[model samples]
Target: MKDIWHPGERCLAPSPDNGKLCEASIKSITVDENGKSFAVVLYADFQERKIPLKQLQEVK
Candidate 1:
């Protein structure tokens, strides 16, 4: 299942290190040449990280 997301959209994504819920904004969404989707998420603490689409979830 493809998780549709857009840049600047708010989401409740999980932290990769501790698995905590992060209040984040989508920075960008991209797919590699091989078709692996990636999402750049900016957290509240001013940290930006790249994570796979499957790890992201909608705020609602």
Candidate 2:
């Protein structure tokens, strides 16, 4: 389904490896029983986390 955010979408995320920000791709989306959702972005440089919806810097 087409929503605000989806998998394989390229976006920017805060660097989990360092102090700078890096680009990443949404690997999967996690949703809660409360109807809230979040994105699981995986960086090519070995990074993945469930970042909050607001911080998801969508670039694609």
Deviation (Å) of 50 in candidate 2:
1.3
lDDT against the true structure, each candidate: 0.84, 0.76
User: Residue by residue across 13-40, what tens digits does model 2's lDDT show?
Assistant: 7778773668888898888998777888
CA deviation > 4 Å runs, candidate 1 = none
In model 2, pairs of residues that clash are none
Candidate 2, superposed: residue stretches over 4 Å from native: 1-3
Please list all clashing residue pairs in model 1, or write none if there are none. none
Candidate 2, run of 10 with poorest lDDT: 51-60
Best by TM-score: 1
